[PDB]
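Limitations
The structure tokens in this dataset are predictions for the assembled complex, not deposited experimental models. Users should treat interface geometry with appropriate caution, especially where small molecules or nucleic acid strands are included. An illustrative entry is reproduced here so readers can see what is and is not provided.
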Amino acid sequence: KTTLFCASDAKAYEKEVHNVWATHACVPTDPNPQEMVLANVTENFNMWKNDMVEQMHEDIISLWDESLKPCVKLTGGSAITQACPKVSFDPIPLHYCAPAGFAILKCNNKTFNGTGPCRNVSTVQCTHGIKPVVSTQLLLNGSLAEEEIIIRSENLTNNAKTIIVHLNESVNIVCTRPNNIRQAHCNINESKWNNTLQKVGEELAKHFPSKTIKFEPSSGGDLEITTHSFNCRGEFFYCNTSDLFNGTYRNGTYNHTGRSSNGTITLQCKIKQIINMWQEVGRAIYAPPIEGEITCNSNITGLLLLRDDTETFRPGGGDMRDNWRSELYKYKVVE
Amino acid sequence: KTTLFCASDAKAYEKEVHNVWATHACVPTDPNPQEMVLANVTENFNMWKNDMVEQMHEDIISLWDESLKPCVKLTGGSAITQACPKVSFDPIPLHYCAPAGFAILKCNNKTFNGTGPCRNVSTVQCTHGIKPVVSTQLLLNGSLAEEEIIIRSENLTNNAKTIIVHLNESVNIVCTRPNNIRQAHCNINESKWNNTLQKVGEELAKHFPSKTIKFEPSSGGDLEITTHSFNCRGEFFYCNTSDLFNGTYRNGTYNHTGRSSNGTITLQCKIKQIINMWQEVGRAIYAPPIEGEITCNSNITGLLLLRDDTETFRPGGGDMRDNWRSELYKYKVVE
Amino acid sequence: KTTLFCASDAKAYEKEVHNVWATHACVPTDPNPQEMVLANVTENFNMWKNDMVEQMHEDIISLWDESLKPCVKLTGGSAITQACPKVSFDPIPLHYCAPAGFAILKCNNKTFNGTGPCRNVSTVQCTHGIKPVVSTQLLLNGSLAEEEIIIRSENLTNNAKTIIVHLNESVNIVCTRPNNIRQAHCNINESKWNNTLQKVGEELAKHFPSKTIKFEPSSGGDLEITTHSFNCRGEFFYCNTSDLFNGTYRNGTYNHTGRSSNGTITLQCKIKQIINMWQEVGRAIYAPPIEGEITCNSNITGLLLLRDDTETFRPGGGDMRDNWRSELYKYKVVE
Amino acid sequence: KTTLFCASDAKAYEKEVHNVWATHACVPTDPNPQEMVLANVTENFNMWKNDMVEQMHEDIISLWDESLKPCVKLTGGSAITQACPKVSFDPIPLHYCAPAGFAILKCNNKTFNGTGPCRNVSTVQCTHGIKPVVSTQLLLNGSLAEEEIIIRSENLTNNAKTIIVHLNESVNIVCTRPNNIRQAHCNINESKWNNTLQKVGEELAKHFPSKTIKFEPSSGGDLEITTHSFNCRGEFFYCNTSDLFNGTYRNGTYNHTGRSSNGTITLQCKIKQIINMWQEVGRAIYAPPIEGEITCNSNITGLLLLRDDTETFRPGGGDMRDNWRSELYKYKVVE
Ligand SMILES: CNCc1ccc2c(c1)[C@@H](CC[C@H](O)CO)[C@H](CNC(=N)N)[C@H]2NC(=O)C(=O)Nc1ccc(Cl)c(F)c1
Ligand SMILES: CNCc1ccc2c(c1)[C@@H](CC[C@H](O)CO)[C@H](CNC(=N)N)[C@H]2NC(=O)C(=O)Nc1ccc(Cl)c(F)c1
Ligand SMILES: CNCc1ccc2c(c1)[C@@H](CC[C@H](O)CO)[C@H](CNC(=N)N)[C@H]2NC(=O)C(=O)Nc1ccc(Cl)c(F)c1
Ligand SMILES: CNCc1ccc2c(c1)[C@@H](CC[C@H](O)CO)[C@H](CNC(=N)N)[C@H]2NC(=O)C(=O)Nc1ccc(Cl)c(F)c1
Ligand SMILES: *[C@@H]1O[C@H](CO)[C@@H](O)[C@H](O)[C@H]1NC(C)=O
Ligand SMILES: *[C@@H]1O[C@H](CO)[C@@H](O)[C@H](O)[C@H]1NC(C)=O
Ligand SMILES: *[C@@H]1O[C@H](CO)[C@@H](O)[C@H](O)[C@H]1NC(C)=O
Ligand SMILES: *[C@@H]1O[C@H](CO)[C@@H](O)[C@H](O)[C@H]1NC(C)=O
Ligand SMILES: *[C@@H]1O[C@H](CO)[C@@H](O)[C@H](O)[C@H]1NC(C)=O
Ligand SMILES: *[C@@H]1O[C@H](CO)[C@@H](O)[C@H](O)[C@H]1NC(C)=O
Ligand SMILES: *[C@@H]1O[C@H](CO)[C@@H](O)[C@H](O)[C@H]1NC(C)=O
Ligand SMILES: *[C@@H]1O[C@H](CO)[C@@H](O)[C@H](O)[C@H]1NC(C)=O
Ligand SMILES: *[C@@H]1O[C@H](CO)[C@@H](O)[C@H](O)[C@H]1NC(C)=O
Ligand SMILES: *[C@@H]1O[C@H](CO)[C@@H](O)[C@H](O)[C@H]1NC(C)=O
Ligand SMILES: *[C@@H]1O[C@H](CO)[C@@H](O)[C@H](O)[C@H]1NC(C)=O
Ligand SMILES: *[C@@H]1O[C@H](CO)[C@@H](O)[C@H](O)[C@H]1NC(C)=O
Ligand SMILES: *[C@@H]1O[C@H](CO)[C@@H](O)[C@H](O)[C@H]1NC(C)=O
Ligand SMILES: *[C@@H]1O[C@H](CO)[C@@H](O)[C@H](O)[C@H]1NC(C)=O
Ligand SMILES: *[C@@H]1O[C@H](CO)[C@@H](O)[C@H](O)[C@H]1NC(C)=O
Ligand SMILES: *[C@@H]1O[C@H](CO)[C@@H](O)[C@H](O)[C@H]1NC(C)=O
Ligand SMILES: *[C@@H]1O[C@H](CO)[C@@H](O)[C@H](O)[C@H]1NC(C)=O
Ligand SMILES: *[C@@H]1O[C@H](CO)[C@@H](O)[C@H](O)[C@H]1NC(C)=O
Ligand SMILES: *[C@@H]1O[C@H](CO)[C@@H](O)[C@H](O)[C@H]1NC(C)=O
Ligand SMILES: *[C@@H]1O[C@H](CO)[C@@H](O)[C@H](O)[C@H]1NC(C)=O
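Predicted assembly:
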């Protein structure tokens, strides 16, 4: 254990809130990246017991509390008011770094599921650039897997633990509230979603080799988890995924049961002002949306699922630590 | 430097907030105190750089935070609203104690002014019972000097430094909002205040030997310090002292120039709901006062003064550290 | 996170080194403990991330450095020598206690594994009496589980994580060197060992589907961990467990295949002077053993195991922090 | 509050013990000296409450414990023996450095007494090169004030607080045991000492504006502080200063009353093997001196004085943190 520090390519002249946070919170990044390969050493990792995740989680909570200040923050019977201006919000990469006396070991196995022994490992000073993208159900703007799709989970047997599906080919998603000021929509290409959900069904079938693999929507919870919720240019998008997690993989082949038009799935979305926070147990009230075309052009790079004759997988999330684990699985800080 | 702990006679059954906080934060007072005298040993004390004061200060800050919750708390544009019930509020004595391996040296030189060598020292484990009374200008319900009045200051030649006047006999002040509901008043017996300012002028004259001494009201600043402000029964009293600090000591003889009637000085008071906090920079808003007759009967045991041919002294205070120093002056925690 | 203090009933007249250390380092035990029970609760515990264990670890390191002074201590090629008298050495219980305002919550579910939620928790200010017994492989003189033998592990699937087996009924082990001066031996009743190993195999079989469950001696490494090593009356015993951790649990029955005679397993032991320290990475050299009959009559109360068709368990140990966790599986410092 | 790191031009091939400690304890100094000057800015410093002093203190304690091992070390009833080889001993400069996310502000006021506000401040990453020279009474081989001679004290009215006299012109002292094997002597040119003490009396008279300034020898105590004690090439010199601190500054002129011969003051020295340690309380016993001619040619750069019709000043010291303060007064560590 230690206390890592962050490095970023943030610019002090920029008024984007990730930049403004990182300029006072993190140190300039290193153009001199030294990495030492060692093929004979083998080390053990547990991405689900990684304290880098806790440190980044606290850092990102700080980022949001200093950047996305709500008009009202309701917590523990208390109500906190403050100025809630519209801001320029677009996440930037953050590197996490070990101080003197410590190193970060990085697993070089491209098929590593994030748990157990990795026997090609290198030593580095900082992780790669990580954008702190808060979202659920879908992981956006992450890093793709270099080889095959990877299924990660602390206990695939345990239906309560979140499953992280690490994709190897990105799936583009475009969400837009165009120029009702709270109604929006996302567009996704049905063909790419079809083939990536087919190969995800294959990878999931290998861990469930008399079991049909079904994809169905979230059954219940707060709207933040029953929809694809995320933040776009400052506004809180809640996008219905009934037509996205909706299909069946049986006998090696995927059939999509959700609904398209001219080859595209469109999710209906609402820009909400009352938010159930992820940083703590409480609610946050923001100002109505800004004017004009609000669009985010993101890459789906991962999935957050929960498992329930056959096995059924629904979208999940909510604990943004899982978001940070999707990217910090390779890393472990050693002395 | 060590972490001290508190000890009190707080009762588990008492709804009064000091008792409630002490049942959870302090231990019961040792009914078998031990004190060992060292009459040949001489040790150096400095009441103005005493870590015991910082410790008691933080203890009382959290006492007030857990007990006297305001309806609104405003810190530079940010407003926290909570439940603000009326509570029962009567300060109880607190003893401060060193853990194992540490002791508390107590200077028993009844002449001691707070700084320098003390030659009659002793060793205890805990201080005497100290009521944490939050006040300006007047020190209430403290413990009196044994022989003559003591004048304490970090640096008498520095007019910015607060002077603490430690009285050897107490002046009774009775303060009441009787049964506009925010109007109250305070009665002081003018002959006792006469004699007290007489001999305080004597003792200050010794330190400024012509220089006719002059007592005058506070020059300016926030209402909390320009008045005798205190808390009685939970309500915040602000009482004008322009008739109380109003005199001239000249040619060894005292001269009170404030208005009086039937031998008693009466201070006009307001119960205010908007407060400038002492714990931190900010404002605190409380509920309208409770119904009925609100009375506190206190012993003025000390004065807080500021010095501006002739020397003029005006009531001061504000930094509650000085309130604690008025009682922690004769102690020092040694390993 | 806080600084706890120890309590003991050490007596100042005792020449025994645990007493000598505790009288100077701990406070007399308080004789009316109020276990404030509660019953709508669950709080999460993690015996494998517990600051209590580290503070106890540091205090025991200090005790051993002040009490069991080696003739030589070699640390990083640096050799410091000092007086190495033979001392009276018999561990005494130490209660650990939270200071003023902080509490120790305690889980009373007597099937509680050590990590996860707990449901019948009380509150005290001090733990029970814990004797700091330093040993490997077998835990001695601990507290027994009341109901059933419990298996504790940071992660039962990571073979590299130490497994603690909290036993139920103590197995008496008697270790002696009689009146070669460094040759000793220890007797264990083989029937009770067979019984206990059957129960341990039963519960490890419910934790591991149902492969045959073999017990084998320690792989390799320093003698301190390859043997049951402990300290008795100051002398360092290294006892061979090859005829002890040696059986096969198959068919729901346990078959012991270590050598016995007349119904007793006897381990062969050497008393050593050169010791690989547990407090630090270094070596200590002690004096030749004392004259006379050196024997300890101890209760095996727990086991320290390591896992590698079938699963094999071997005696582990080495990190005395796990010895502390076995009696602080816990409790918890709370405010 | 942070943990600094050192930086030295030490050589990994020099057997000199400061070099050998600094190659395994320090990083290389960098020709990266980016000084940042900020005149608008102005900050508060207190050279007497500066954690850099304590961090350098512990570092130098570590160096001495690893470099000048005594044959015998007596502390608290315990006696520790180790090899005590004669080593090559010559202190080298050490830079102290704030890690990433921290900076070191340095006050560029050349008249700064070390306490209060400084209007010209600059930020760098590391202090200037500071030789950790352990001595009493006279500060050796340090940095010189750039304009006037500076008087430093956390309280000049408290006679117990050490006074540091920062000289602007260095006074040469040559100490030698030539080729009784423990008899040595120091030569100091009497006229430069005459001028140095006259201007020191001038500054002290400014701060004591009557008060004939009188330099007298140290009253009493351990030999370490009643003499100018220091270490030269590994040997512990104790040199008598009764002919050094022995003069009177009256009506603006200084008269040296110390015994002089041929215009040079000669201090008699003993090389001692039993030393009262400065690191902790206890004694340390070293081997007899080496053979040959043992000489240090040093620059007196400051004084350590203590104040008793007049004011008397005697040489003092013995808390090597004051030695560190004489160089670490300019600096303060910031986030
Ligand atoms: C089986 N799953 C367990 C599960 C389920 C739901 C939730 C958690 C855990 C919490 C995580 C706690 C964290 O670990 C503490 O640090 C969190 C509690 N907080 C409440 N108010 N309920 C709650 N998640 C959120 O509400 C959340 O993600 N909202 C949100 C906002 C903005 C955006 Cl853009 C967004 F995409 C999402
Ligand atoms: C020359 N004098 C310096 C001086 C002057 C005024 C004041 C200080 C210092 C502060 C002390 C800071 C402390 O040291 C930090 O811990 C404090 C700042 N805080 C603000 N909001 N301005 C401010 N004092 C108060 O406002 C205060 O006493 N109010 C108060 C309330 C209730 C009761 Cl019953 C009462 F009797 C008093
Ligand atoms: C897979 N297991 C990991 C493993 C393995 C072996 C060992 C550790 C860890 C260390 C623990 C370090 C500690 O955590 C730091 O505080 C310790 C290192 N130290 C060295 N010299 N090698 C080393 N254990 C010991 O050597 C030890 O127990 N000896 C000992 C003496 C007297 C008695 Cl009576 C006794 F019963 C035992
Ligand atoms: C009014 N003055 C207070 C005063 C007075 C004398 C002394 C202190 C304080 C201690 C400082 C404690 C430190 O702060 C803890 O870290 C120290 C205690 N230690 C003992 N054994 N008495 C003791 N000083 C020394 O003995 C010392 O300097 N010897 C020494 C050796 C080698 C060399 Cl070359 C040298 F030039 C000097
Ligand atoms: C991940 O791989 C390890 C082996 O390296 C295995 O023990 C574990 O069960 C795997 N987990 C999943 C979810 O595949
Ligand atoms: C991604 O992984 C799948 C297997 O899950 C594989 O079939 C596909 O070819 C991969 N895509 C690549 C390597 O571009
Ligand atoms: C550690 O890895 C195991 C598998 O090796 C995994 O099941 C578990 O979720 C991980 N985290 C733990 C046990 O805290
Ligand atoms: C996962 O959970 C199952 C049952 O919930 C359990 O048998 C297994 O030991 C757990 N851990 C793993 C598979 O690492
Ligand atoms: C998603 O849409 C379907 C149909 O439009 C609806 O039945 C479902 O309740 C919606 N879910 C959410 C979370 O709005
Ligand atoms: C899949 O989508 C269709 C409409 O597109 C909907 O009727 C159906 O219920 C969905 N499947 C679910 C919710 O399991
Ligand atoms: C993903 O990245 C692109 C380009 O940086 C950006 O336009 C988009 O808004 C991002 N999506 C999210 C959710 O931040
Ligand atoms: C307090 O006593 C000390 C000790 O002599 C003295 O130096 C100081 O001036 C005194 N201060 C006051 C305010 O009396
Ligand atoms: C209080 O002190 C004054 C001197 O300041 C003295 O004249 C007076 O008699 C004292 N009163 C007592 C001791 O009651
Ligand atoms: C210094 O000591 C004097 C008397 O001992 C005291 O009045 C003063 O407050 C102390 N501190 C200073 C001058 O900063
Ligand atoms: C006290 O004040 C005087 C002038 O106001 C000043 O000379 C002195 O340095 C101050 N501090 C002390 C005496 O500690
Ligand atoms: C106190 O009252 C007088 C007259 O009654 C007034 O001049 C003065 O301003 C008042 N001071 C405060 C602080 O209210
Ligand atoms: C003293 O009190 C009178 C009222 O009785 C007032 O007029 C006078 O201004 C006061 N003295 C001051 C404020 O200095
Ligand atoms: C002082 O003490 C009396 C009696 O204990 C009490 O009535 C009064 O309210 C106290 N004053 C303050 C300011 O607490
Ligand atoms: C140092 O200068 C400050 C003014 O910045 C002054 O307050 C302090 O008394 C001075 N101290 C000494 C020892 O000269
Ligand atoms: C050193 O300072 C003294 C006064 O303290 C001054 O008279 C002398 O000229 C200075 N020497 C220099 C600046 O070289
Ligand atoms: C200083 O020393 C010289 C001899 O080197 C002597 O002649 C001179 O008078 C002395 N001056 C003073 C002021 O003591
Ligand atoms: C220094 O020398 C003088 C006379 O030479 C002597 O009286 C004094 O005691 C010596 N000081 C010490 C500390 O030995
Ligand atoms: C100064 O030196 C002379 C001769 O060395 C000595 O007699 C005198 O006592 C000294 N002054 C002191 C010790 O104050
Ligand atoms: C002072 O520096 C010189 C030159 O490096 C050196 O010879 C001498 O030993 C140093 N003095 C001390 C006391 O270390």
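Some entries come with short summary sentences. For this one: The domain at 5-334 of chain A is CATH 2.170.40.20 (HIV Envelope Protein Gp120; Chain G).
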